[PDB]
Amino acid sequence: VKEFLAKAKEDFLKKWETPSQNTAQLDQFDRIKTLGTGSFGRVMLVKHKESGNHYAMKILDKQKVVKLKQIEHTLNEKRILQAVNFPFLVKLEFSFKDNSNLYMVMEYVAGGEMFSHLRRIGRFSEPHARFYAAQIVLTFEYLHSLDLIYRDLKPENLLIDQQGYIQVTDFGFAKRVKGRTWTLCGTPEYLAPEIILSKGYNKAVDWWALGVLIYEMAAGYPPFFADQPIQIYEKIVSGKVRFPSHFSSDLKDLLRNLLQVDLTKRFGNLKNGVNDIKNHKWFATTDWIAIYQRKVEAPFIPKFKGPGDTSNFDDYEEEEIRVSINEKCGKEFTEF
């Protein structure tokens, strides 16, 4: 446990120091459909010819990454994702690049985004939200022990697997840092106030992000919302939050301790660290070892109609991968 992370941090350090490269090639896979589109690329369901396995391929257009000045962030994403190993973190299977793009082939989580189920059902009950929250708690403890800050927690980045457990995806803003960083990045509704105020920040922002997640899951809507981000920012730094009348007092107390503007008082960032969170009353019935071992029975199991089934993902406009005859930005992505 306190020594489980010992071994863990050892495997990470080797892969962090000397990262894997070019472990596959584009012609080994048959592209099937888009699962999710994004800023500089997309994610498609692909099928590995030699094994018959399905995977999720993230495709990043090098030229676009450079234009939006996300070179460092992108290298971070791959370097970290290939080195981490946790039951609730998506597994990176292969990575490679070509003249035009960067590719990351991960395990395929068929259950879809937590976001989709959350918006469809409306909100989750407390024990259901607790189930998911417990998983993030252990993942952040794992990640922070390796000096990594996540910075992008949100239902859109959480996928439900065949067992009903969650897999954290998208390490676009993940970063290994000892001390504090200054990048304004993340998603508006989940940004901690110290990010907005440009004060320089640390791992505490992730615990803030957790308070927002738990709030959204249970309420069905985020604590701070409005039509325009700037309006959202204004709300966050005020810290003034109201709770649905159906929230248990135990939940309200945990959220007041996570959604605390004063880092000096924010749970997770205190002398007891994560334990202030793990020992909270709302988590009294939660058996952490059973969660980690994934033996607890998930409260929600997505419908699965065989592998390669994308029923749990909305549809998107298909595009054809374009590969130039000329190498683009080769020197910038040398380490990828």
Binding site: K69, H73, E156, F173, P188, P222, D227, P244
Partner: peptide
Amino acid sequence: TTYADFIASGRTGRRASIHD
């Protein structure tokens, strides 16, 4: 209700990250 106001807002769909 708060829910009513949220559902009427323009940020009910998938939320994109910011880079700044």
